[PDB]
C-alpha cells in the first residue's frame, strides 16, 4: 500500500476516495473516476485526456495524454506516492 502526497490525495477524495492509504490499483481506479467526474476525456476520442488547467495536469506536467501510454502516469505516481 501507498500514501499519496496531498495534491494527489485531494484528486482521489474529489472522486470519492476515503482516507489516506490505498493500493496502487485503488489509486488508478480513483484517477479514472476523477477523469469521468470532471469530463476530462474527449467524448469523440476517448483514449485522449485533456487535463490542461486542471490540478491533474499540474501533477502530470502535461496538457494532454493518451490512456494507451502509461509512462506519464507512472512518472507522476513515482513522485506522488509514498511507500
Amino acid at each position: 500500500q501507498v500514501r499519496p502526497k496531498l495534491p494527489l490525495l485531494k484528486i482521489l477524495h474529489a472522486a470519492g476516495a476515503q482516507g489516506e492509504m490505498f493500493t496502487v490499483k485503488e489509486v488508478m481506479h480513483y484517477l479514472g473516476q476523477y477523469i469521468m467526474v470532471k469530463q476530462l476525456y474527449d467524448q469523440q476520442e476517448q483514449h485522449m485526456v485533456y487535463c490542461g488547467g486542471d490540478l491533474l495536469g499540474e501533477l502530470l506536467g502535461r496538457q494532454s495524454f493518451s490512456v494507451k501510454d502509461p509512462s506519464p502516469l507512472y512518472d507522476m505516481l513515482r513522485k506522488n506516492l509514498v511507500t
Partner: peptide, 8 residues
C-alpha cells in the same frame, strides 16, 4: 473511456 482506462 472505461475500456481503455481498465487496460492501463
Amino acid at each position: 473511456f472505461m475500456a481503455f482506462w481498465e487496460a492501463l
